[PDB]
Symmetry: D2
Subunit: 224 residues, 4 copies
């Protein structure tokens, strides 16, 4: 298996892209520590890591309501803060928590499950977009720093991928959705969650040691 003998800490394992990651990574021989801890709590990240034991791979899987269609003037203080609390501050907490053991072993893997809203204008998702931009910045800044210790940090910039938070079954079923998707997505279809996990698998495996601090657009061509 491509992750044989590896132990993978997956945050918010039932949220966002976690379910397909469990399936694919376990098929490939990984032991997946499927964590559900609320990492918006200061100190929670360090406790998760202490309890996990030996970690080879951190999958930083965070999601928050995009509030599709909410305008800049409707983006009130609470909606804005919730975006940062939910997917930005926990990212640094969990990465800072895992890095010491990575540095000790001069080896580690971090895959951040981000969004193409961190790459290009995404209509009607202002606060969410800026929070994903901050995550992208985290990978851009941490990646080259951690690479000195043979640690890979990379960012999957997904869009048009099936999940509960952004492309849930009721939303993607309408003719209106399908028409817009055909206009905007060159490949003309949504990604499956398994397809996302296969990219994550590459970035989590030792097949990708030379990829550092990169944002890989997983969007059917949307941001091209």
């Amino acid at each position: 298996g491509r992750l044989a003998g590896k132990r993978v800490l997956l945050t918010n394992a039932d949220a966002y892209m976690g379910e397909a990651t469990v399936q694919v990574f376990e098929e490939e021989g990984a032991e997946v520590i499927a964590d559900h801890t609320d990492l918006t709590k200061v100190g929670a990240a360090e406790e998760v890591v202490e309890r996990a034991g030996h970690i080879d791979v951190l999958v930083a899987n965070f999601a928050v309501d995009a509030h599709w269609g909410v305008t800049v003037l409707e983006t009130d203080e609470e909606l804005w803060q919730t975006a940062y609390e939910t997917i930005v501050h926990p990212l640094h907490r969990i990465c800072r928590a895992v890095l010491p053991q990575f540095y000790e072993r001069n080896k580690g893997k971090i895959v951040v499950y981000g969004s193409a809203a961190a790459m290009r204008y995404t209509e009607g998702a202002l606060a969410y977009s800026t929070a994903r931009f901050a995550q992208r910045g985290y990978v851009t800044a941490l990646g080259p720093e951690a690479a000195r210790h043979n640690v890979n940090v990379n960012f999957i910039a997904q869009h048009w991928t099936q999940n509960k938070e952004y492309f849930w079954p009721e939303r993607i079923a309408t003719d209106e959705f399908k028409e817009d998707m055909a206009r905007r997505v060159p490949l003309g279809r949504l990604a499956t969650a398994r397809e996302h996990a296969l990219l994550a698998l590459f970035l989590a495996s030792d097949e990708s040691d030379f990829i550092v601090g990169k944002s890989i657009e997983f969007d059917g061509g949307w941001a091209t």
Copy 2:
């Protein structure tokens, strides 16, 4: 004057790039409201705009200590939050406050004084870089939304530019600094604050109405 008759609200007018903006913009006919209000306080932005009255241009000038050289493991919770509190959350507060009057008139200008740390890896500036990324994301997300109302929102991604916060006189006077800068900056010199204000002048003027949601790198070639 290239800003003749225009009223310009400048945040944190004594910090970062504000002083040269005052000088250049007033030279060009603008009335510059030089604001010193602490916009980390909820409610402050709306109060500033109400007092300011008619605004043609918002200059979103925010800065925070980059903590040059501090690594990921030394980036504690407080340092991280301070970066977002100082330059990320206030940016939405002040833009959200100015947009309503722009939307009534279907005309507006916002110039965000950001950093090239929002574009590329900047050694030893992790939290600052991610917060500047969030600002770049704000311009990327808001720009196209606001452009439907004929409002320009753009981002200056500066680096290697003279200012108190990042390139202060004592720091830039050493031989070691100058040798590092010669290696990293193709132009081989720092920018003046006036040079920065001249780019901001272009983006604040009606000469730049077709520039929407862009990051212009102001870095002597560093990120090229």
Copy 3:
């Protein structure tokens, strides 16, 4: 005037964006050498520069039919080569011819009139897009090299701008064009040629000495 006392060599001055550059640059005090030489001929660029004498600014104004709608399979060898012959190879010839005098003086300005098709996928313009990418590459590669001699080379990545080659009056007049433009351009209008010349003015002036090897997207938000 913002170009007072400057001499500007403008290639293909009766094509693409040249007319508005003549008008705006002359308004700002420049002597504009409006060149009409076929720079696809080896040797022509050096003869143009010999006849021009002292040049402060080179405006590299090149355009070729984009063949809107022609697909990859219909992009035949002649169409492909014509794109490179028309806008790629002449660009190096003319920049190579002007750089020596800039290097004697350790000062110079080059503005390359490119396209946002050098930045993002542009439906139905394959050969043209790749050739504009090559021009973008020329600015990216030459910019930092020339900056060591205090020479600025930058790239305007335009789209949705009025001109004979891409957005000519008959094409832009139709309801169908306007509805597509409203969907794809956040600003919801085309740029005027004068607006393009005002960005070029900034980049050709000594107000922009710190801008090195950059691509500035002039597209109403299209690529944002």
Copy 4:
């Protein structure tokens, strides 16, 4: 079984640049690799290679030319400039244009272009080469979304600091100057092996990557980050 089981892969200039490791890794993964050595600077050669090849599932567009490291803009004469485009730009469109009809007929296909991080950021002392690699990156950016409508993936590997003879031959990498420059500019602090490059190509050639469309993946140890 192998991740390219049953697949037939046309690999251009198979002994040059990154071709040898592609053959090794792809064959280990069950691919049949058509290792081509045809000079694709000749008009008509691409379509002849493709007709000779038979059924193709994957095109690996592997092209290289001397970067002329250190040659300045003023020293980049007409021949040096033209040769960069002749060698890696014009052949890329010829060979992709030649393979796309069968991909379109089957509504399935894979193209991996072996490019360079010189298509992404300033690369000191490689001017003509950088612009030619930009043109290749433009080709993927422009073709990728067009070909995706036919369920064809086209992607670009933007490599730097990667084992190959064209850019990292022994004398170049042996100098103190090179090692100091690498340590300052390459976050991972080492060159990649060609096998590592082929493992990224393997992902992009496989059906594990169908949602990746027109992308430039930087393979450079973090250099361009």
